[PDB]
Design a protein around this nucleic acid. Structure first.
Ligand SMILES: [Zn+2]
Length: 682
RNA sequence: GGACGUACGUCG
RNA sequence: CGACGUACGUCC
């Protein structure tokens, strides 16, 4: 625990009573700098008053690491260190646990909720508000909401003992600015939103700083794509047959979107299929008998087209065998559900060509040249040095499993052990990885462990304790300047590589302008560090006044809701589920329904990941009680002592009884109606 | 169930 | 100069 020569120079502007934007590229250095700043701040206070330094941390793993190191560093002098999260703030007194403690490591959403309902009426209780990854301050971030409350308390005219912002970062970022005159504007806007006048960056001890944060050399591997594609042809033929079968029941199908020319296996086609799906979900017929079957068949057709587009997107970046395995997994998952006349025709049409797909996929003469170049550079780097660890980055969760399967099923490379980690992702699906499943993978990834290469998603981009890699390879990965710095900064070993393998010149141009934006942000920081403290304070005060005027001017009230009785039909089956006359709002965020006429309209299923949000408990997942629907309506929780199902309007269509038209919403804020609050009775 | 961020992309 | 879709990630 020896303080380095650069950490003192980084903390010297912070030990003056002024808010700082300290930016260090190293990992442990920021933690040691925050600990030294906390140690210096908890000693300047005289007798009769103590400090209330609060260190905000977004992610749970980095929060637990910071809490562990803070306890191990401060539980010797009589400094009570605690920590609040979702598994901590169930029924604890938040104001009491803030009062009787000194270092609070809460998660900023909890603090925003506390400032919202009835807790901590003024932020003058704390005296040192440190942020982890302060560059995440953005349009409506929880960090930005805390800073909005701080700026409101400051400019309200009742500014008392305001705390100090020592929010550390690793990269300020440019965002979307082209020129230096807009990059400096964005940096000044971030520095005003964080309410500071000093941006600390190590300049004197650069020779003693470059020995631990040794940056990797980048290498672009732009190569051509596949020319002979006997897989895309037959998949596009099956997609054309499915589209003609969909157009057999819907005459005006081409006029349901504004797409001029669509290509199969593209993001344009993936947008068009969702557009035509949301267009045919609101189809109306004045019989209400065969309309259900028509919309159900149309939903099945659009689901099959979307899955074929996703399979083509997977096959364009990976092999044909794993794409066939994904299609077979989808067909097996839909096979376990009900089987009508509509699904059986698509299933037999897929089974009539599955043998042809397998015979084309088994041929090793049409493999991906991206995967060939990746295996070539991997075996080259492992022949040059066998003790290299890679944190190879792929963007899609459905493609990191593909990369793991390609690494496992390959006779050319046998020294690679998959250590693939994904992350949480969706909280209402049986996908992704859990916190202990990720922690055991991160602990089992050393220089001598049973893992030498892991296929990371974007979870490894943010603040997380990973081993010192030297073989960063980005397989079709595209990001901003912040993502590029956070990805390049991971390979801080004594000699590393930052390979970028894309089949597009667009991603190479994006990486080139990202490096240009990094150099421009460095020049902008060097220019901004030369300004005086008096002019910069007036500039950030003007920017804060303008932002406060913009925030207080755009106060749009709730419009007058249509006090009508409308029914919420199903999104897939278009069956009568319930009315809007009985919709209860629990905590201005969750919407439930009541009555004995709804309990026989849905079925239950065990939930994959049960947890609690703030006061509920994930008990079951609900589904439509039709013959073959299997539609995710919502979830089933227990509020205080009674179980209620809370639904989402996203899997719903709002049909009006008076007029007869049916609209389509996505979120609950867009739906305006006579919302009755939840009563504990009935 | 909800809130938030990033990247790509499509219409106006 | 603005909504919308997807993918990814974080949180309550
Ligand atoms: Zn249904």
């Amino acid at each position: 625990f020896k303080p380095r020569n650069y950490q003192l120079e980084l903390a010297l502007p912070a030990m003056k009573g002024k808010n700082t934007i300290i930016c260090a590229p190293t990992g442990c250095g920021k933690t040691f700098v925050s600990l030294l700043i906390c140690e210096h701040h908890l000693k300047k206070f005289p007798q009769g008053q103590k400090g209330k330094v609060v260190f905000f941390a977004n992610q749970i793993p980095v929060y637990e690491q910071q809490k562990s190191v803070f306890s191990k560093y401060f539980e010797r002098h009589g400094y009570r260190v605690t920590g609040i999260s979702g598994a901590t703030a169930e029924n604890v007194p938040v104001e009491q646990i803030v009062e009787n403690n000194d270092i609070i490591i809460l998660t900023p959403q909890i603090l925003v909720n506390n400032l919202k309902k009835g807790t901590i009426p003024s932020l003058s209780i704390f005296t040192l508000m440190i942020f982890d990854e302060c560059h995440n301050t953005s349009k409506q971030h929880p960090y930005n909401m805390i800073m909005f409350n701080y700026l409101d308390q400051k400019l309200g005219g009742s500014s008392g003992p305001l705390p100090q912002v020592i929010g550390l970062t690793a990269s300020v970022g440019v965002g979307d600015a082209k020129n230096t005159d807009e990059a400096l504007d964005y940096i000044c806007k971030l520095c005003a939103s964080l309410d500071a006048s000093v941006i600390a960056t190590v300049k004197h001890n650069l020779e003693e700083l470059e020995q631990v944060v040794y940056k990797p050399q980048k290498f672009f591997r732009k190569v051509e794509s596949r020319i002979s594609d006997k897989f895309k042809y037959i998949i596009a033929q099956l997609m054309r047959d499915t589209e003609s079968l969909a157009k057999r029941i819907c005459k005006d199908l081409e006029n349901l979107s504004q797409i001029q020319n669509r290509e199969f296996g593209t993001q344009k086609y993936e947008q068009w299929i969702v557009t035509v799906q949301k267009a045919c979900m609101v189809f109306q017929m004045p019989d209400k008998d065969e309309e259900s079957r028509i919309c159900k068949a149309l939903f099945l057709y659009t689901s099959h087209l979307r899955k074929y587009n996703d399979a083509l997107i997977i096959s364009e970046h990976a092999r044909m065998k794993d794409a066939l395995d994904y299609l077979k997994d989808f067909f097996s998952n839909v096979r376990a559900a009900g089987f009508d006349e509509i699904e059986q025709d698509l299933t037999q049409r897929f089974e009539e060509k599955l043998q042809e797909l397998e015979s084309v996929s088994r041929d090793p003469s049409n493999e991906n040249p991206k995967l060939e170049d990746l295996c070539f550079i991997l075996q080259e780097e492992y022949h040059l040095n066998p003790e290299t660890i890679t944190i190879l980055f792929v963007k899609t969760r459905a493609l990191v499993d593909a990369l793991k399967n390609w690494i496992e099923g390959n006779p050319k490379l046998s020294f690679l052990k998959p250590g693939i980690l994904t992350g949480r992702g969706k909280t209402n699906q049986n996908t992704g990885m859990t916190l202990p499943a990720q922690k055991c993978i991160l602990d089992a990834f050393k220089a001598s462990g049973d893992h030498n290469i892991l296929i990371a998603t974007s979870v490894a981009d943010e603040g997380i304790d990973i081993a010192q890699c030297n073989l960063v390879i980005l397989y079709e990965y595209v990001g901003n300047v912040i993502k590029m710095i956070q990805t390049r900064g991971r390979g801080r070993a004594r000699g590393s590589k930052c390979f970028l393998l894309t089949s597009n010149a667009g991603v190479i141009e994006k990486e080139q302008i990202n490096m240009y934006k990094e150099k421009m942000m460095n020049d902008s920081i060097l220019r901004l560090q030369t300004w005086d403290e008096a002019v910069f304070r007036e500039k950030i005060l003007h920017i804060q006044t303008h932002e406060k005027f913009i925030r207080d001017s755009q106060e749009k009230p709730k419009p007058v809701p249509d006090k009508e009785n409308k029914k919420l039909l199903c999104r897939k089956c278009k069956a009568l589920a319930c009315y809007t006359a009985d919709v209860r709002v629990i905590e201005e965020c969750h919407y439930t329904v009541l009555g004995d006429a709804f309990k026989e309209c849905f079925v239950s299923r065990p939930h994959p990941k049960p947890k609690q949000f703030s006061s509920f408990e994930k008990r079951a997942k609900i589904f439509c009680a039709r013959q073959n629907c299997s539609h995710d309506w919502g979830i089933h929780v227990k509020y205080k002592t009674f179980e209620i199902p809370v639904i989402k309007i996203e899997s719903f269509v709002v049909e009006d009884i008076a007029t007869g038209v049916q609209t389509l919403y996505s979120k609950w804020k867009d739906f305006h109606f006579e919302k009755i609050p939840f009563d504990p009775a009935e």
